[PDB]
């Protein structure tokens, strides 16, 4: 025994499966419209981004 | 119903189709040339609809390929598709065929040690016997490593694209600019391939649309005889930092050279290395490690190739 | 609160008078305060946002 | 299309909205080329902090890594920027605070804030960060500050080591002031971290003593025939007192085929000094409009 004791500190993770409750009509959403934007044209393929 | 709205935004933002003019039938050549000329003439008038047709054009660019014609004694049939190419143009009066130096071939012209590059010497011992047929063409692998003019002769080109290897003469096609695609019609992204033994990766740091790949050709002398060395680098740090990072890699070489040349030191001996710029790689594309008969070879996706002059560093 | 300029896409009206005379020199040495030029790629109605 | 939207994760106030409103159309460097980005990447003062000493080389050395983007829109919840492709025609507006007149066919380069940090630093206290702006400057002053900033870190090391070496009054006027046509400007270099400004100076001393070992002797002997005979308009730094070391190399005779091998080797180390006097990216302006202050340049980094 050297002349000092010591304390240890750890951390530990837990995969907790949760339960969410959320009351009626609290948030109000505003949905836009999907808009397509072409951004690349190659010789092989054309990409897009919605 | 909302997917039918997206079926219009796709079909209104596509590029216009490339015109196909049949040159084999007679009355289908008339109907195809006419729709060039009736449709170009409405892309020139000053009305609003004719200016509407001139805005849909999508100018995607194509790479510029080189056609090289090599001896099969100086280019191995076993080369991965995407090996980098160095040209060599010491003499001009012949002008018959060309020399192309892959990095696993230039490893034999240097004579550098097999403890610096452990794996690629065994593969360069089976693709070439003793490095003779590579070095039968240069009578100055001892007078271009003294006077320091070897880097002035190499011009970097680009990766392999197509090689029709024959018994005597090998026909090699490269890609100099742009993203390297196979020229043949199933166009595949033939990216640049380097062995993991040659490439030395340098790297909170920001990343752009760019991480370049540099080529350093370093002069040294082993066994008190001249013998160069070549390494590849990869960092997106800007040209002021990489020259400071390469000199850290070669601290043990600059010290152990000038000790060997302490007493005699001619003015031609002072030039040490040179850094080229081979091309850029976009960030978000990591290289994939790949083994070939075994040789650990990186492969890059979407390596678009550029070319820089050799700049001496020391 | 001072009255400030704004580039919102107003429905501008049409006058019988011309306004063009001496404007290029009057912009240089200020005939009138609080102006803003718009050259070629930016001389348009700005997009409406709110 | 190409754009960058940048969130302001808390909020922002009405004073710093008017501060970000005056700074519209200015080039800032930001971290990553993602469409979505937070506040921590946009500052050039993520390395240039207030409680720590700045490092104007390392700040500038950080600037050739980043992507560079132009502001378009300032919103109270976001900042929408437009980026700069590495080979792209674009437009840059002369907002920047020490007004230097540009023209068509000029040569721009991006520099750190080297005259007033307090002008460039506006603090965003609603998020616990400050966004710091560079200054785009034609390369005639881009290089000339880096010539001057390295002269400071030579002679400040001598004076801080021993104050009897350097007189302080001549030190302040010469090592800090940048000479420009018409005006002389005072650098903001008083409390810096010179530890990466000496590694640049430790790379000059490798290239420079090589250039002293192989001076061609015909150019030395042309000085001794010019500093005491003729009065040329740019040799007047050298008075009639020639440096004594030049005359002490005159003891050998001339030789043309031994100065070709000195002119050639000295030539390829002059091409190496473009790795130590580097600016950031370059902006080749090909059109400019002085009444709108709007340049239209070509971006090419490295």
């Amino acid at each position: 025994h050297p002349g000092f004791a010591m304390t240890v500190v750890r951390t530990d993770e837990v995969l907790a499966e949760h339960i969410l409750y959320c009351s009626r009509a609290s948030t109000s959403m505003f949905v836009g419209l999907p808009s397509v934007v072409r951004r690349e044209v190659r010789s092989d393929a054309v990409t897009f981004e919605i | 119903e909302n997917a039918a709205r997206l079926g219009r935004q796709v079909l209104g933002l596509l590029p216009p189709p490339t015109h196909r003019v049949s040159l084999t039938r007679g009355p289908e050549f008339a109907r195809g040339v006419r729709d060039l000329l009736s449709k170009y003439a409405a892309s020139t008038r000053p009305t609003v609809g004719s200016l509407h047709e001139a805005l849909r054009q999508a100018p995607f660019r194509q790479p510029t390929y080189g056609d090289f014609l090599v001896y099969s004694q100086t280019f191995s049939p076993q080369e991965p598709l995407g090996t980098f190419l160095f040209s060599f143009k010491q003499e001009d009066n012949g002008s018959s065929m060309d020399m192309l130096l892959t990095p696993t071939s230039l490893f034999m012209l240097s004579g550098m040690e097999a403890a610096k590059a452990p794996q690629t010497h065994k593969v360069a011992g089976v693709w070439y016997g003793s490095g003779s047929g590579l070095a039968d063409f240069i009578p100055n692998l001892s007078e271009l490593m003294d006077t320091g003019e070897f880097h002035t002769l190499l011009t970097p080109v680009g990766p392999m694209v197509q090689s029709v290897h024959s018994t005597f003469v090998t026909k090699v096609t490269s890609a100099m600019k742009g993203v390297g695609l196979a020229r043949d019609e199933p166009r595949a992204h033939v990216g640049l391939t380097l062995p993991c033994d040659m490439l030395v990766d340098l790297d909170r740091e920001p990343a752009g649309l760019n991480v370049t790949i540099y080529a350093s050709l370093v002069y040294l002398r082993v066994n008190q005889r001249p013998s160069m060395a070549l390494t590849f680098f990869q960092s997106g740090k800007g040209f002021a930092e990489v020259v400071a990072m390469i000199k850290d890699h070669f601290t043990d070489v600059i010290r152990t050279k000038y000790i060997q040349l302490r007493h005699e030191l001619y003015i031609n001996r002072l030039v040490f290395g040179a850094v080229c710029t081979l091309g850029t790689v976009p960030f978000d594309s990591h290289p994939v490690h790949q083994s070939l008969n075994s040789l650990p070879v990186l492969v890059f996706a979407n390596f678009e190739a550029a070319c820089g002059p050799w700049t001496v560093f020391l | 609160m001072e009255a400030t300029l704004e580039q919102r896409p107003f429905p501008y009206l049409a006058t019988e008078a011309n306004l063009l005379t001496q404007i290029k020199e009057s912009a240089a040495d200020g005939l009138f305060k609080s102006f803003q030029l718009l050259l070629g790629k930016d001389a348009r109605e700005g997009s409406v946002r709110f | 299309d190409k754009s960058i939207v940048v969130n302001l994760t808390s909020r922002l106030f009405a004073d710093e909205l008017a501060a970000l409103q005056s700074k519209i159309g200015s080039v800032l460097p930001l971290g990553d080329c993602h469409r979505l980005q937070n506040i921590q990447a946009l500052g050039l003062g993520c390395v240039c902090s207030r409680e720590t000493s700045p490092d104007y080389i390392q700040i500038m050395q950080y600037l050739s890594k980043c992507t560079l983007a132009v502001l378009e829109e300032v919103r109270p919840d976001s900042l929408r920027l437009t980026r700069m492709d590495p080979s792209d025609n674009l437009q840059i507006k002369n907002v920047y605070a020490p007004f230097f007149q540009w023209d068509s066919n000029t040569q721009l380069a991006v520099l750190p804030p080297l005259f007033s940090r307090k002008d460039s630093t506006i603090v965003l206290e609603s998020n616990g960060f400050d966004i710091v702006f560079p200054m785009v400057v034609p390369q005639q002053l881009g290089h000339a500050i880096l010539q001057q900033l390295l002269v400071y870190h030579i002679y400040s090391k001598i004076s801080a080591g021993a104050p009897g070496d350097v007189n302080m009054a001549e030190l302040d006027l010469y090592t800090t002031n940048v000479s420009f046509m018409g005006r002389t400007y005072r650098l903001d270099v008083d409390n810096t971290d010179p530890r990466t400004a000496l590694r640049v100076l430790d790379d000059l001393s490798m290239y420079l003593c090589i250039l002293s070992a192989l001076v061609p002797r015909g150019c030395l002997r042309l000085l001794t025939a010019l500093v005491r005979h003729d009065r040329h308009p740019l040799t007047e730094v050298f008075e009639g007192v020639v440096p004594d070391e030049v005359t002490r190399i005159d003891l050998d005779q001339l030789s043309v085929p031994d100065d070709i091998t000195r002119m050639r080797v000295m030539f390829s180390y002059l091409q190496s000094l473009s790795s130590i006097f580097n600016l950031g990216p370059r902006l080749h302006v090909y059109a400019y409009s002085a009444e709108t202050l709007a340049a239209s340049c070509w971006y090419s980094p490295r």
Side-chain angles (χ1 to χ4, degrees):
Chain A
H1 196 276
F4 62 97
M6 60 185 67
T7 75
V8 184
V9 178
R10 290 190 288 110
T11 54
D12 286 321
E13 292 182 351
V14 172
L15 286 170
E17 293 179 354
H18 285 274
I19 294 176
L20 179 66
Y21 181 75
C22 48
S23 67
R24 183 182 65 87
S26 294
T27 313
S28 75
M29 304 306 294
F30 288 92
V31 173
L33 291 174
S35 66
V36 178
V37 173
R38 177 182 60 80
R39 67 182 183 178
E40 291 184 355
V41 172
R42 294 179 182 176
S43 295
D44 294 330
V46 178
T47 63
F48 290 95
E49 183 178 1
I50 296 175
Chain B
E1 191 272 330
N2 201 5
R5 184 180 181 271
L6 272 68
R8 294 177 181 176
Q9 291 181 356
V10 170
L11 273 70
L13 270 69
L14 291 173
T18 307
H19 296 285
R20 298 287 181 181
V21 174
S22 67
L23 269 66
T24 63
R25 293 181 63 191
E28 292 291 327
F29 181 76
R31 291 180 65 191
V33 174
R34 185 179 176 181
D35 290 333
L36 268 67
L37 303 175
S38 297
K39 191 182 287 185
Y40 176 72
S43 296
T44 315
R45 291 183 180 92
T47 189
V48 184
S50 69
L51 190 147
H52 190 195
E53 297 292 326
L55 265 54
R56 195 176 288 172
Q57 301 292 319
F60 62 97
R61 293 178 66 89
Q62 293 178 356
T64 62
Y65 297 100
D67 291 331
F68 290 158
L69 202 146
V70 193
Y71 292 95
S72 66
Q73 56 187 349
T74 62
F75 184 79
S76 298
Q78 295 179 356
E79 292 291 330
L81 189 64
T83 312
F84 193 74
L85 271 60
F86 292 96
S87 295
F88 185 78
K89 295 300 291 182
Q90 183 180 2
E91 63 185 1
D92 190 76
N93 200 4
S95 295
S96 297
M97 281 169 274
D98 195 2
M99 181 182 291
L100 272 61
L101 294 175
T102 62
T104 60
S105 297
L106 183 56
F107 185 78
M108 294 299 290
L109 281 80
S110 67
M112 62 180 287
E113 291 291 327
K116 299 293 187 292
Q119 185 65 40
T120 64
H121 187 273
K122 183 176 73 175
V123 182
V126 68
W127 293 351
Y128 298 98
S130 66
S132 65
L134 292 167
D136 285 332
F137 290 160
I138 306 104
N140 287 320
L141 285 179
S142 65
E143 296 177 354
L144 292 172
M145 303 179 184
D146 287 331
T147 62
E149 292 180 354
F150 187 80
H151 68 275
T152 62
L153 296 174
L154 296 182
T155 60
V157 175
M160 281 172 66
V161 170
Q162 183 179 2
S163 293
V164 181
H165 183 78
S166 298
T167 299
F168 293 95
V169 171
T170 303
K171 181 70 170 65
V172 178
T173 302
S174 64
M176 294 182 184
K177 284 175 68 177
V179 179
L181 279 75
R183 186 191 282 177
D184 294 337
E185 193 67 30
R187 293 181 184 270
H189 291 284
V190 178
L192 174 137
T193 64
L194 298 176
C196 297
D197 198 359
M198 295 295 173
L199 188 143
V200 177
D201 197 359
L202 277 305
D203 53 356
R204 182 177 179 179
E205 291 181 354
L209 195 61
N210 190 358
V211 44
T212 60
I213 293 170
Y214 293 152
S216 70
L217 191 143
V218 167
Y219 294 146
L220 58 90
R221 290 180 65 191
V222 76
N223 291 317
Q224 294 178 357
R225 290 178 68 188
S227 68
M228 65 182 70
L230 179 138
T231 58
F232 287 147
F233 293 106
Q234 180 178 2
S235 67
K237 288 180 177 67
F239 186 71
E241 303 192 6
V242 184
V243 177
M245 294 296 287
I246 292 168
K247 293 179 183 180
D248 290 333
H249 191 198
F250 294 103
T251 301
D252 292 332
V253 179
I254 297 169
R255 293 177 65 89
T256 58
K257 178 192 284 193
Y258 291 158
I259 291 170
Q260 297 296 110
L261 282 78
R262 182 176 179 180
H263 295 86
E264 58 91 16
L265 183 62
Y266 295 151
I267 295 172
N268 291 317
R269 298 290 191 273
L270 272 81
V271 58
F272 183 76
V275 172
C276 178
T277 298
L278 304 181
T280 66
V281 175
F283 183 74
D284 77 353
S285 68
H286 291 176
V288 177
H289 291 82
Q290 184 65 253
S291 295
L292 297 175
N293 58 0
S294 296
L295 186 61
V297 175
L298 290 173
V299 57
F300 292 101
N302 295 317
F303 176 79
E304 60 182 2
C307 182
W310 295 96
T311 62
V312 178
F313 71 100
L314 177 55
Chain C
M1 186 65 205
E2 294 291 326
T4 62
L5 193 149
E6 58 183 359
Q7 295 91 12
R8 293 187 183 275
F10 294 153
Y12 289 92
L13 276 70
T15 60
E16 179 68 29
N18 56 358
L19 299 175
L20 291 170
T21 61
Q22 299 287 320
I23 293 298
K24 177 70 179 296
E25 182 263 317
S26 300
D29 296 330
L31 186 65
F32 49 87
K33 299 295 289 183
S34 70
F35 63 96
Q36 180 71 42
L37 275 80
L38 294 174
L39 290 180
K41 67 189 73 65
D42 292 334
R44 68 182 183 273
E45 294 88 5
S47 66
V48 47
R49 64 188 63 193
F50 61 94
Chain D
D1 193 5
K2 59 180 183 294
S3 67
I4 294 169
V5 57
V6 175
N7 290 319
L8 273 300
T9 181
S10 298
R11 284 176 76 89
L12 58 87
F13 293 103
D15 195 3
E16 62 187 1
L17 192 145
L20 288 172
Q21 188 60 254
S22 178
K23 299 290 187 291
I24 199 66
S26 178
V27 174
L28 61 82
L30 58 91
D32 293 331
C33 293
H34 293 287
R35 296 292 302 273
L36 186 62
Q37 188 61 255
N38 290 318
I39 196 171
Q40 293 182 357
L42 272 67
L44 187 144
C46 63
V47 64
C48 182
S49 294
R50 294 181 180 178
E51 64 182 1
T52 63
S53 296
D55 193 355
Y56 287 166
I57 294 298
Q58 182 69 44
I59 290 162
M60 181 180 174
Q61 195 177 1
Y62 179 77
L63 189 145
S64 66
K65 290 179 179 176
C66 295
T67 183
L68 279 76
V70 180
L71 277 79
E72 289 180 352
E73 296 173 354
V74 173
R75 291 180 179 178
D77 289 332
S78 295
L79 292 174
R80 291 181 67 191
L81 285 80
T82 182
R83 59 182 292 169
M84 296 165 75
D85 288 334
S87 180
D88 196 4
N89 291 322
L90 57 91
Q91 186 183 7
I92 184 169
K93 185 170 75 177
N94 192 4
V95 189
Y96 293 89
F99 183 74
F100 297 110
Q101 181 68 40
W102 299 348
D103 53 351
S104 64
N105 291 319
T106 189
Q107 186 68 39
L108 297 179
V110 182
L111 289 172
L114 290 169
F115 301 112
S116 294
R117 294 175 69 191
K118 188 181 286 184
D119 193 2
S120 175
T121 58
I122 56 168
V123 60
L124 278 72
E125 293 179 353
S126 179
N127 208 166
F129 184 75
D130 51 348
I131 297 170
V132 182
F133 294 146
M135 59 187 292
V136 301
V137 169
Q139 285 188 354
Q140 294 179 355
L141 280 166
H143 289 151
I145 299 167
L146 193 146
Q147 313 308 106
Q148 183 62 256
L149 192 148
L150 294 176
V151 170
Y152 182 77
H153 293 291
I154 294 170
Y155 290 96
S156 70
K157 186 65 187 295
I158 300 171
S159 67
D165 291 331
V166 176
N167 299 115
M168 295 296 172
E170 299 294 327
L171 183 67
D172 195 7
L173 197 148
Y174 288 165
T175 60
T176 62
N177 290 319
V178 172
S179 67
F180 182 67
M181 57 181 183
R183 300 291 178 89
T184 60
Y185 295 100
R186 174 68 172 86
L187 291 174
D188 197 1
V189 184
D190 55 353
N191 290 318
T192 57
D193 192 2
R195 65 182 181 177
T196 66
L198 295 174
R199 185 176 176 86
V200 175
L201 291 173
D202 288 332
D203 293 332
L204 281 174
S205 66
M206 291 186 287
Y207 294 114
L208 191 60
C209 281
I210 293 173
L211 294 175
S212 71
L214 45 89
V215 178
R217 304 293 179 88
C219 184
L220 284 170
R221 291 177 63 89
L222 194 145
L223 282 170
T224 62
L226 191 145
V227 299
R228 66 175 67 91
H229 293 284
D230 297 331
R231 293 176 66 89
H232 187 74
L234 60 91
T235 191
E236 292 178 353
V237 175
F238 293 95
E239 292 295 329
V241 179
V242 65
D244 199 5
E245 194 274 336
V246 179
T247 62
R248 299 294 294 162
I249 310 299
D250 193 73
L251 56 90
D252 287 329
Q253 294 178 355
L254 287 174
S255 61
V256 177
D258 287 334
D259 285 330
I260 300 298
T261 62
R262 290 182 182 180
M263 186 63 73
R264 185 179 65 244
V265 173
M266 185 181 174
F267 187 80
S268 65
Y269 288 108
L270 264 61
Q271 290 182 355
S272 67
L273 292 175
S274 65
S275 68
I276 203 168
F277 296 110
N278 279 317
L279 299 173
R282 291 181 182 178
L283 295 170
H284 300 279
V285 176
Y286 62 94
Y288 185 76
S289 297
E291 64 184 1
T292 319
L293 301 177
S296 66
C297 58
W298 180 67
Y299 180 78
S300 67
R302 295 177 183 269

